[PDB]
Chain A
Amino acid sequence: DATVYVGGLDEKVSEPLLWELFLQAGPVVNTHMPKDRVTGQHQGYGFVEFLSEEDADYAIKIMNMIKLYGKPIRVNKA
């Protein structure tokens, strides 16, 4: 579960902000939030590697708490 997939985001959101968003729940050890080079903008889906299982199990619940720019965010195991 150490990693989660996160959908439905707005490009003003940032990886550093994202790390602080999910570390509100529990620390994101490895952050991945693609920067698309071609048009220089984000599609808004994320992958998160944690310390161990602990971060992963919480992950799905952490999704409900999240609400970026008046919108929700998908979090599921991976």
Chain B
Amino acid sequence: MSFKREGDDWSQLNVLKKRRVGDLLASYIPEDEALMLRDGRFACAICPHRPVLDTLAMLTAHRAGKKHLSSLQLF
């Protein structure tokens, strides 16, 4: 398996996929807007009640939503 690679570890590949999705989506979120918690979750720092969201995919989908946009323009 050294000379030509054999097989693939689909669980670790899925871990890598989660990292690459995270890096991609994170580069479009400015550093003030998102606060990363101790366990790897994310809070929205715009919205006054700080909702906490499990992934960066959910944080991006939240930042699309109308509650966030209304809370955004006040800040």
Asked if chains A and B are in direct contact (CB within 8 A), the reply is no
Which residues of A approach B to under 8 Å, CB–CB?
none
